[PDB]
Amino acid sequence: NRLESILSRFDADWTASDEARREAKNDLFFSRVSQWDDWLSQYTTLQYRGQFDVVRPVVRKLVSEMRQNPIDVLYRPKDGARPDAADVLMGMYRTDMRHNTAKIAVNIAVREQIEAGVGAWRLVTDYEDQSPTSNNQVIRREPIHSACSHVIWDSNSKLMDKSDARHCTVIHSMSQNGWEDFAEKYDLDADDIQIAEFYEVVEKKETAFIYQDPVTGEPVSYFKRDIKDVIDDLADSGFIKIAERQIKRRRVYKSIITCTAVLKDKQLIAGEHIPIVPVFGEWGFVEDKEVYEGVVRLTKDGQRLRNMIMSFNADIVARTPKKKPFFWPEQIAGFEHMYDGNDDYPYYLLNRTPLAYYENPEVPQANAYMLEAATSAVKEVATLDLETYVFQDNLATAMRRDGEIYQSIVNDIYDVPRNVTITLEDGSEKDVQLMAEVVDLATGEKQVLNDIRGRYECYTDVGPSFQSMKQQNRAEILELLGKTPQGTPEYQLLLLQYFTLLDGKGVEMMRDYANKQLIQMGVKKPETPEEQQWLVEAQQA
Amino acid sequence: NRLESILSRFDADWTASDEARREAKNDLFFSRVSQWDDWLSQYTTLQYRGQFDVVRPVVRKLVSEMRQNPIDVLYRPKDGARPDAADVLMGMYRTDMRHNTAKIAVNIAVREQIEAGVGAWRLVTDYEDQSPTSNNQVIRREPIHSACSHVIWDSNSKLMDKSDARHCTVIHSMSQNGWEDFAEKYDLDADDIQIAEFYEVVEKKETAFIYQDPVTGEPVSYFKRDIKDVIDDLADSGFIKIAERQIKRRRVYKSIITCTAVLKDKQLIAGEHIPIVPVFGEWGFVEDKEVYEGVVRLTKDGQRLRNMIMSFNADIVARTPKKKPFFWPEQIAGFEHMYDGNDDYPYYLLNRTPLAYYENPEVPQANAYMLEAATSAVKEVATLDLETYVFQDNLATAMRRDGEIYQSIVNDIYDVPRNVTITLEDGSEKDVQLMAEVVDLATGEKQVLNDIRGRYECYTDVGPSFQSMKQQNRAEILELLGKTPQGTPEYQLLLLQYFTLLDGKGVEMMRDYANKQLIQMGVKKPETPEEQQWLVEAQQA
Amino acid sequence: KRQRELEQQMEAVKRTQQSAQYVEAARKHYDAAEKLNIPDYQEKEDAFMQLVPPAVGADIMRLFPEKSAALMYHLGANPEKARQLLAMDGQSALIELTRLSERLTLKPRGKQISSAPPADQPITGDVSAANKDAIRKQMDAAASKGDVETYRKLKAKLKGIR
């Protein structure tokens, strides 16, 4: 009975999204296969057909714009948990962002968003250090090519993140070998090719009927049955009824279904939230329909104009300049060997019975105007800000939602004592062991290490990159030195800081000397004992 | 009896706002589906349907301008309230603004405002930290997509903020199964699908018959029945009647109705004000009717003109440059394989009985000034001020009303001692208990510290951003140092103020050293015991 | 720093039982003060034991170490009432001191559940009318491509919804 309900829900979402679906297929075929559609193909007359697009430089400069402004996701320490666990979580998030597949997914999805609007990569988890001894898992992200063709969001959800959705399908048109390996990496390979992964979120919503007493009110009457279990307790309590907080418990589930036959997998255990995270362009509802827009349609119309005028001009060019004459067959009855083009005769001979020619097409010379008319359309209808704010802020929303999903997966995974490498800010990699406590010093009471086990809020802060802020600081302090009297300790302190803020392999020894001195007059606090001995030997002097 | 009264009021408001609703949805359909209205596709002669709009760049510029103009909402501590509770309340407003959902709601509201005119987002509160142990809640803001038809304001209200409106509906749609599940989540199901969420603001309007005695006048005879109860007292009091101060008590109420069937929910309480706060463009009354505008009407006319002239251009270009001849069928009666276009012969044949051709449409070259004039008009009439003053000041009024409702609901919910984190200015996060009932040690009174509950009025100051104020202060002080003799203590004071006023992770060492120094010679008061120790250590030196 | 010098004093004495019990009582005193972190008190307690006999302060230490901080803050901050309590007899002085310590109260964790939870309910739309228009537009699209079977099924679905 489950199969037909799932199919009905999928069909409903399919129909609801089908407009944006066909429209995005048109867009991707435009931007990835050919710029000319069938619509112009039937409504056209030129013969020699050529498309010289200029949209691709535009999309390249746009994706460069999204590249030059990195987006970072932070983790709010909630439930009174220590900030350091959030710091460690940001460390894992960064060390998972620095991996190559992370850029692969991000770039593919953002490029599809620029052209189509939705690229929507998907989170994945897998075993690492392949050995039967360990069961530690890592978390990766898998991009979906033409995600608008293989990602079907729930129609009821009305969210940027689509996190309002309780379910989503992912179709997979597989070949024979495609069906084989696709099934075997998850399930049995018996075949009924359209296969799908119906993801789904189950939830548990109740009333919980909280009660109050003379003493502080503990949770009472969690369910409807509980009230019938406490019929005397509800009446004899100091306070009868105060609130009905509807606590909810939700769980995501993955199902492997097929269009024709029955589903191959019923429900699967994978994290807490949907591994799929969508990216949107300027997206909204217009008379209650999901609409999201990119830069393909407007630049597309401009490109169609420009390509049709250039092909018209080429059709003008594609002809022999020689004039084609008009005369009777009897008018050249004696002279047929001359009017052939293969020879050059001194004079043209004609019999008794001053002729007309065929008018070759000519340029209107007005085609210039419209040429750049188009040009202007394609190269500034799209852009000109410093960035198309909607694109990167939708990207930031996608980043933060990916943050909560990744945090949920990590919480659902990282319990066993593990050792992981943290990519700190400034890209400083560092190995940090997760847990197994190690006997306490103060109390000898376990105190599980780190224990990122918890509940944090993910939030991004788009703005000054670390490289940008450090360059600004270097320029600022350079100006300061340009406007600072010498001799004063501030001058030298700023000098040392400037050497500290420089590059690596080149000025590493001067930077180290500056750090040493900074620690030695006490401005910089010691973090390693050698600096402490340097401080004490300086201060005793 | 209630349902048909609600329906009559809704229909009256719907009839009052029908013109605004249809024009706004027309503008959206123009801007969001197709810029060619039905009249255009009617009144046209074209065959190419291309859409070369320029509205999106201008909208992007405007939205960027609003984004770069942050708005803060402040709360005046009224009735002699402490400034600290108001400060914490602005901290709360800040820590609810920076949440991604609130910002997204704001962006959607403003973009659909610049598009149609109205964004009118929706507040919402819900249980936070789901656990039957507690009942604490947070408040969120969710946008209303295409609010011009899903939100129906009271017709009788005549405010920008619509505080006069005592009712407003929210429109949704259900499928059948959607109908039963929506009922099950809330109410019972009556089978039939458009729904309405008709809210209510009811008030108790009384005169209170304020009475005075030789002693200061206490509220006497609150009701009209009370006067009948004090007939002897009113003649016994020293003063029989002076004033009739109309004290009032009002509450917002929530109801769920449906178009055909009976209402789903009769009476529900959520706060005291209508959570929906609307935004408007150039809004006013034109002959006793509400009107709000956008940047889409005249710009829509101009965009239609540009699109149709460019379609003229494309259609003129879109035909074969080759010339089509006209002749009698017998004129080429024998020579038909000449005139095919499939081959090119050195010459072409004509029998005994110098021919006619088809006139090709040609570019006037007079189109130019039309194209560039329309382009300039559509770029200029929209924008360019430094900001479209009506839009951000209307947004400021919307922020003021939003903060008003925020204070109301927070007063309505946050009576429990709770622990809330404060996002102060410069985004400085810090966690503080709501009341913190801890007793004075010098006085001995319970003295709940903050007790944010009270009555505060909102007032917004758009202008110099905190980052903007920081940057301009840095510029000013660096100029001062440029024009200041060195050696003077004021020189070093300004230096230290600058380093303190600098950015974070970059120059934190100079900033910390500067704060240390400034505390040490006593310019700034110490704040944490290390600072006091540093100050006293310097003083004794 | 005062805690440190009292630590030096305990070490000097150690290097006696009454002085010990008094100094652990003063250590709980300092723990309570650090919980309070009232800086002006640091002068208040020592000015207090200057004003009062050391035996009285020692008994205050012994009977209630952590409540001693609060009462000495009250008495130093209000030296007049400290003088009147000193004048009046010692046993009823202890009675008044205990009553004042209880006056400040402690751990009032009565109830923190809720305060009038309002109708905090969300909203939802499935865009069913938009779905009807959607079926209409798939019908229009199928008309273009000549997909007759899908066209007729879409027509039936359109006519089935009222």
Residue numbers in the entry:
A (entry chain B), B (entry chain L): 6 to 197, 217 to 377, 388 to 418, 443 to 599
C (entry chain A): 71 to 85, 157 to 303
Text from the published report:
Tailed double-stranded DNA (dsDNA) bacteriophages and their eukaryotic counterparts, such as herpesviruses, possess a dodecameric portal at a unique vertex of the capsid; this portal serves as a channel for DNA packaging during viral assembly and delivery. The portal interacts with multiple copies of a scaffolding protein (SP) to form a nucleation complex, which initiates the assembly of the major capsid protein (i.e., coat protein) and other minor proteins into a procapsid. The P22 procapsid consists of an icosahedral coat comprising 415 coat protein (gene product [gp] 5) subunits, a dodecameric ring comprising portal protein (gp1) subunits located at a unique capsid vertex, and an internal core comprising approximately 250–300 SP (gp8) subunits and 3 ejection proteins. In this study, we present the structure of the SP gp8 in complex with the dodecameric portal in the P22 procapsid at subnanometer resolution.
To explore the interactions between the C-loop of the SP and the portal, we performed local reconstruction of the C-loop associated with the inner base. The C-loop, which extends from the inner base domain and interacts with a hook on the portal surface, is primarily located in a cleft between two adjacent wing domains of the portal subunits. The C-loop interacts with Val474, Leu292, Tyr191, Phe187, and Met179 in the wing domain of a portal subunit and with Ile266 in the wing domain of the adjacent portal subunit. During DNA packaging, a conformational change in the portal may disrupt these interactions, resulting in the dissociation of the C-loop. Each SP trimer interacts with two neighboring portal subunits, and the SP’s C-loops are embedded in the cleft between these subunits. The portal undergoes conformational changes during DNA packaging and phage maturation, triggering the dissociation of the C-loops of SP subunits from the portal. These processes likely lead to the disassembly of the dome architecture and the expulsion of the SP.
